[PDB]
Amino acid sequence: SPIFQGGSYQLNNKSIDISSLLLDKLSGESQTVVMKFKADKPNSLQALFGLSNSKAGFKNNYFSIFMRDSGEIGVEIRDAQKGINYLFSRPASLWGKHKGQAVENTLVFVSDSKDKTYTMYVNGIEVFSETVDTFLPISNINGIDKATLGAVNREGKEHYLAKGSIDEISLFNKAISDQEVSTIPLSNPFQLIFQSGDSTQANYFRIPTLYTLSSGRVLSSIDARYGGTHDSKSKINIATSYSDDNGKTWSEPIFAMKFNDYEEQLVYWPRDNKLKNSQISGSASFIDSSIVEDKKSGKTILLADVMPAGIGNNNANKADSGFKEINGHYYLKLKKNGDNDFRYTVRENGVVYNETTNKPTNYTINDKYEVLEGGKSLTVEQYSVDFDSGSLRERHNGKQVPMNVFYKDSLFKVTPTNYIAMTTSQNRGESWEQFKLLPPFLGEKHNGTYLCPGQGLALKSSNRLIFATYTSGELTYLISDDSGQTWKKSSASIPFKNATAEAQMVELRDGVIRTFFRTTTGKIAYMTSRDSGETWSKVSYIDGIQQTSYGTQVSAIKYSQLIDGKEAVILSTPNSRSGRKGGQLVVGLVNKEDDSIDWKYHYGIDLPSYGYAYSAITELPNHHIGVLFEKYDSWSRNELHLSNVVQYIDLEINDLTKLE
Ligand SMILES: O=C(NCc1cccc(F)c1Cl)[C@H]1C[C@@H](O)[C@@H](O)C1
C-alpha cells in the first residue's frame, strides 16, 4: 500500500530525479517516507531525499532528509512565502559499517498534519518528535516541482550531493501510527538492553558494564539517568539486566541501587542551547557502577559511587570522608536540621548518637539508610521535575516516601561528599540487597575515591576480589579476600594531578595483573602488579592508540583462547585525538618472555567519524565478544541528552583479526 516505491538507487555525487514517478501521487497533508539506505563514505553534509521548488527565486522552498558524516540525521522543511524555516535533527543517529560491511539503516519519517507533529525514527529508535504551532505539510511547500534522491534541486542546481545508496524508498500519503512503525522489518547490527520507556523509566543511559558469570549468564549494569545525560548532581539510579542465551535476549531491568527522593520520570530533556545545562539539583544519586563475581561465596558484587542530594563531583567536599574514626572503627556522621556542624554519628545497630552528650538519641537508621524514631518510619515528600514554566522546576509532588539520610529533606543528613557503596546478589542479578557504604580508605580529611566503571577483577587462583578506584595523584585498588565483607586499599601512585584515571584490569597470568587506564596525555597508560595487587609498578604508555587530551574510559579483558598461538588481551576504546569516536577493539598478544604486549590487530566498530565513548566488553560463553557501548560523543556539548545510544553488538574473533 505505499503510494510509491523504488530501490537499488546508487548515489554517486549525482542526483536522481524521480519527479514523474512521485509528484502526481503526493496527496493530502500527511506523509510517511520509509528509506532503507547505506552510507559508509558519506560527504560531510548530504541530502538523501529532496522535494523542492526548483525555480529561480525560490531556493528556500523545499523539504529535505539529510545526514552528516558525524552520523547526525535531520530534516529541513522550508517555505519562504509562509515564513517557515523548520530544521529538526539529532546527532549520532546512524550506523556506517559493521563487520566490514555497510549497514542498511532503516529510516522512517512521519509528517502528521492532524497532530501537527514531525517524528523521525532510525533503526527502530525515535530520534526526534516535534509538535509545531504552524504545521507545514511537506506537499504544501509553495511551488514544489521536483523530487530528488541524493540531492536537493534549488534554482535548477544540485545541492547537498550524496555518496551512498538507497536500496529501498517508499512513500505513503498517511502518517503511519507508532505501532505500524514497529512492524517495519529492520536490519540492525545491534540491539538494545536498556532503553527509553523500559521498567527503569529513565529516558537516558550512560556508563555500561558487562560481566560473564560462571553459570554462563551475562550480567550488565548501567547508570539509568533521569535528568538528561548529565553526571551527578542529578537523579541517577543503577539498573541491571542479564542474558541467559549468550546475549541474544535480555531481561527486563531491575534496580541494583536506587533513591526515592525524586520520582522516576521519563522526561524529554531539553536540547536547546539555552536549557541543555538544566540539571536536577536537589536529588541523591548513584553514578559509575562496577561488577564482579565471587567464586568463594558464589555472590555477584556490585559497587557504585553514592551522591547525597545536590552533590556531584565538582561540589563534593574534598576534605571530609564523612566518617568519624574511633579506634579502628568508622562511624557515619550526621548533621541534624538546624545545627551548623555534625553533632551525631550512627553506631552499632543503627543507633544515632549525639557526639556532644555521648548519649544515644531516640533515632535509628535502618538497613536502607532511612530514619526511624522510636522504631517508627519518618517520611518526606517526594519531588518531581517539569519544564511547564519554560525552565527546570523541581517540586514536591504530594507523594510521601521514607526519609533517607542522603535526601535534601531529611531531619538528619550525611556529609555533602561522595561515597562508595556495595550491594550483592545471591541469585546472579535477579535481585539485589540493600546497599552498604564501604569504609573510608584515605583517612578522615579525604573524600571518597571514584569507582572505575566496568568490571572488578576476581583472581583465577585465589578468592581475592579487586575493584580499581581513582583519586588525585593515585589509583586506589580496593581489595577483599573474604567476599566483600572487609576491604583494604593498595595505592599506586600516578604522575597526574586531578586526572579522571578510569582503569580496568586483566590478569595476564596467575598473580600478574595489568591495569590499563585513562590519562590527560592523549595516551592510554598501564601499570603491573606481580603479587595479586599488593604492589604496583611505575606507569608506562601504549603508543599506537590515541585518545583526546581529556581521555575516555577504556575496557579490557584477557581472552580465554590463544590467538596466533599466544595469549591475548582485548582493549575497547575510541581511537582518535579529536573526540569520542573511531571506536575500536585492539587485540594484543602477550610476549611470555617479559609480559610485554604486541598490539597486533585493530577492528573498527564503525566509521572513524561515528561516536564511540564509554564501553564494556566481555568474552561470551561461546567465545564471541559482547560489546555494550555509548554510540555517541559523550563529551561533546552538541550531543547531550540523546536516547537509546547505549547499544550492544556481538563479534567473533575472526571479525577482529583482519586487520593488522
Ligand atoms: O571468567 C572469565 N573469563 C573466562 C571465560 C569467559 C567466557 C568463556 C570462557 F571459556 C572463559 Cl574461560 C572472567 C569473566 C569476567 O567477565 C572477566 O572478563 C573474565
Side-chain angles (χ1 to χ4, degrees):
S1 64
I3 207 178
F4 161 80
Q5 172 162 310
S8 324
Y9 299 108
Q10 296 306 300
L11 311 179
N12 286 309
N13 291 312
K14 183 194 152 48
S15 56
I16 296 168
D17 183 5
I18 52 150
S19 308
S20 57
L21 317 169
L22 177 70
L23 295 174
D24 195 67
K25 294 175 183 260
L26 289 179
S27 66
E29 292 179 324
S30 287
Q31 274 76 25
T32 303
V33 187
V34 179
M35 181 160 35
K36 286 190 163 288
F37 82 89
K38 299 185 176 153
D40 67 336
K41 295 140 71 181
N43 295 326
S44 70
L45 170 70
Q46 63 185 24
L48 295 167
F49 172 84
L51 278 192
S52 62
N53 189 328
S54 67
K55 294 296 181 267
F58 293 96
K59 65 180 201 190
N60 298 334
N61 280 37
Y62 69 85
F63 166 75
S64 67
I65 303 170
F66 67 91
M67 60 168 290
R68 297 185 186 275
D69 68 0
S70 65
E72 183 174 307
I73 194 75
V75 302
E76 301 190 82
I77 327 171
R78 312 174 76 183
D79 182 316
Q81 289 67 64
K82 296 153 169 96
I84 294 171
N85 288 290
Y86 284 154
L87 159 93
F88 301 106
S89 65
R90 199 200 75 174
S93 297
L94 300 168
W95 272 83
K97 276 189 144 225
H98 175 67
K99 299 184 182 187
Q101 307 198 276
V103 166
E104 186 175 79
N105 298 282
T106 304
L107 176 144
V108 180
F109 177 67
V110 178
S111 179
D112 181 344
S113 48
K114 193 192 72 65
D115 282 3
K116 300 167 143 193
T117 297
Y118 301 103
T119 297
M120 174 76 73
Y121 299 92
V122 195
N123 301 329
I125 291 160
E126 174 179 309
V127 296
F128 60 72
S129 188
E130 301 286 312
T131 300
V132 293
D133 296 310
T134 304
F135 190 72
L136 180 49
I138 68 173
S139 38
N140 269 21
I141 287 160
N142 186 35
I144 278 186
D145 61 6
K146 293 297 185 193
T148 320
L149 304 177
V152 178
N153 186 328
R154 305 158 86 201
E155 316 207 286
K157 296 151 198 73
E158 293 167 313
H159 285 233
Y160 306 134
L161 277 171
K163 299 179 200 223
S165 69
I166 299 182
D167 317 307
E168 186 177 69
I169 176 155
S170 299
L171 190 143
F172 305 72
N173 283 325
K174 170 197 214 230
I176 67 162
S177 58
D178 214 338
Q179 106 80 50
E180 285 165 296
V181 175
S182 63
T183 73
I184 290 150
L186 304 169
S187 338
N188 290 353
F190 67 89
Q191 61 203 97
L192 296 188
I193 304 176
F194 301 98
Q195 66 204 274
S196 290
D198 76 5
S199 58
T200 67
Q201 294 289 111
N203 198 20
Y204 310 90
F205 299 94
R206 269 220 70 189
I207 329 299
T209 76
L210 282 176
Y211 195 107
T212 304
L213 298 185
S214 53
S215 77
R217 175 175 292 176
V218 184
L219 181 62
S220 181
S221 65
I222 187 104
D223 283 26
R225 295 195 178 189
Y226 296 76
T229 46
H230 289 319
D231 292 350
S232 297
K233 53 186 160 144
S234 190
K235 177 183 172 65
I236 303 170
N237 294 322
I238 303 302
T240 62
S241 177
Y242 53 83
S243 176
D244 283 331
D245 56 9
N246 294 341
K248 294 182 227 81
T249 65
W250 291 83
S251 63
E252 192 71 36
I254 60 166
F255 305 114
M257 288 185 197
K258 73 177 300 197
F259 280 130
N260 296 313
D261 42 325
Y262 278 56
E263 192 184 10
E264 277 100 51
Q265 294 166 258
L266 200 66
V267 185
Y268 295 73
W269 214 253
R271 300 189 79 250
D272 73 292
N273 291 352
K274 291 183 257 179
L275 289 181
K276 65 194 191 190
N277 291 347
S278 298
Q279 190 171 20
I280 304 178
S281 297
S283 184
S285 53
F286 301 89
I287 176 167
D288 294 351
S289 69
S290 200
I291 50 193
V292 78
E293 187 166 51
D294 175 33
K295 299 180 327 253
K296 174 189 292 152
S297 60
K299 287 163 142 47
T300 303
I301 296 183
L302 184 150
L303 273 55
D305 305 330
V306 189
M307 304 293 181
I311 306 305
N313 174 261
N314 51 27
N315 63 350
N317 177 342
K318 291 318 170 298
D320 192 334
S321 65
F323 298 78
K324 196 175 168 172
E325 180 156 25
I326 283 153
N327 334 311
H329 293 258
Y330 319 77
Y331 297 103
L332 182 61
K333 312 175 289 183
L334 301 171
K335 167 191 265 151
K336 193 174 199 207
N337 200 16
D339 299 0
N340 254 335
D341 39 1
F342 291 70
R343 302 170 82 86
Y344 299 85
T345 55
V346 188
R347 297 316 177 96
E348 292 78 12
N349 288 328
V351 177
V352 173
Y353 262 70
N354 185 309
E355 293 304 293
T356 297
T357 54
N358 213 168
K359 311 191 173 284
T361 68
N362 199 41
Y363 297 101
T364 66
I365 306 304
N366 64 19
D367 73 338
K368 306 171 233 227
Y369 290 92
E370 306 161 344
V371 180
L372 273 37
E373 176 188 29
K376 130 276 217 317
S377 289
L378 294 199
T379 56
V380 296
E381 204 176 350
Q382 190 178 68
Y383 296 85
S384 298
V385 304
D386 73 81
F387 281 92
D388 285 8
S389 64
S391 76
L392 171 60
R393 164 177 57 200
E394 302 174 31
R395 67 154 170 209
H396 278 135
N397 66 23
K399 166 174 180 178
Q400 283 180 68
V401 297
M403 181 186 288
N404 188 295
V405 294
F406 285 86
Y407 289 3
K408 196 185 179 290
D409 286 11
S410 190
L411 182 51
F412 292 96
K413 299 183 176 198
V414 293
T415 306
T417 189
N418 61 295
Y419 302 88
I420 291 184
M422 77 171 270
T423 185
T424 64
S425 178
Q426 203 50 41
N427 46 27
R428 305 179 183 93
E430 287 155 33
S431 68
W432 293 95
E433 311 270 35
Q434 305 301 334
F435 71 83
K436 228 107 66 161
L437 304 170
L438 301 208
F441 293 90
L442 305 171
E444 286 183 317
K445 286 33 174 200
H446 192 303
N447 66 320
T449 62
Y450 311 106
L451 188 66
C452 302
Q455 313 186 336
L457 180 61
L459 285 77
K460 177 255 217 311
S461 282
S462 65
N463 285 315
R464 166 164 291 186
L465 307 177
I466 307 189
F467 279 95
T469 74
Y470 61 93
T471 193
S472 176
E474 66 172 61
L475 304 184
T476 314
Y477 294 95
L478 301 183
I479 290 166
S480 186
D481 288 324
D482 58 359
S483 308
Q485 291 161 107
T486 70
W487 293 93
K488 70 172 166 175
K489 77 171 180 79
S490 173
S491 303
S493 189
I494 63 182
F496 298 99
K497 17 187 279 294
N498 246 330
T500 308
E502 298 161 335
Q504 289 286 273
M505 297 161 287
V506 301
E507 189 171 13
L508 291 182
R509 49 190 170 79
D510 232 283
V512 178
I513 306 162
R514 181 151 296 149
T515 299
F516 304 97
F517 68 99
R518 172 169 171 184
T519 68
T520 51
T521 65
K523 300 279 204 249
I524 292 160
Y526 69 90
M527 57 169 69
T528 310
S529 171
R530 290 187 212 266
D531 49 15
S532 304
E534 302 284 313
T535 62
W536 292 91
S537 81
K538 298 210 152 170
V539 164
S540 300
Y541 299 86
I542 299 168
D543 300 316
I545 308 160
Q546 302 207 63
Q547 285 203 345
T548 56
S549 68
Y550 51 85
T552 295
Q553 181 228 28
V554 59
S555 50
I557 55 179
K558 165 80 184 296
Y559 190 61
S560 77
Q561 309 301 301
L562 304 182
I563 289 164
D564 292 340
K566 313 180 54 146
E567 290 167 6
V569 178
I570 304 168
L571 303 190
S572 167
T573 176
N575 187 353
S576 161
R577 41 185 282 297
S578 318
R580 293 190 170 161
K581 59 182 154 176
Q584 301 180 344
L585 289 203
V586 191
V587 181
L589 303 181
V590 181
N591 175 338
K592 302 295 275 180
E593 322 293 36
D594 56 352
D595 293 324
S596 71
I597 295 176
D598 174 50
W599 304 102
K600 178 174 185 192
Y601 303 102
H602 297 237
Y603 171 74
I605 299 218
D606 202 345
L607 310 190
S609 62
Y610 284 20
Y612 189 95
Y614 284 36
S615 73
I617 55 193
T618 193
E619 180 172 356
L620 304 171
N622 61 1
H623 309 303
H624 291 208
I625 302 298
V627 191
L628 182 61
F629 64 101
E630 293 180 341
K631 196 186 174 73
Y632 83 118
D633 187 327
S634 66
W635 188 265
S636 168
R637 171 187 185 72
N638 190 238
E639 305 212 354
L640 294 172
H641 317 325
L642 312 187
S643 283
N644 291 355
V645 292
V646 176
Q647 304 187 345
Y648 177 84
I649 60 175
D650 181 286
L651 295 164
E652 296 176 272
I653 292 304
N654 290 339
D655 296 316
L656 305 199
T657 48
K658 323 124 347 174
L659 54 47
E660 287 265 2

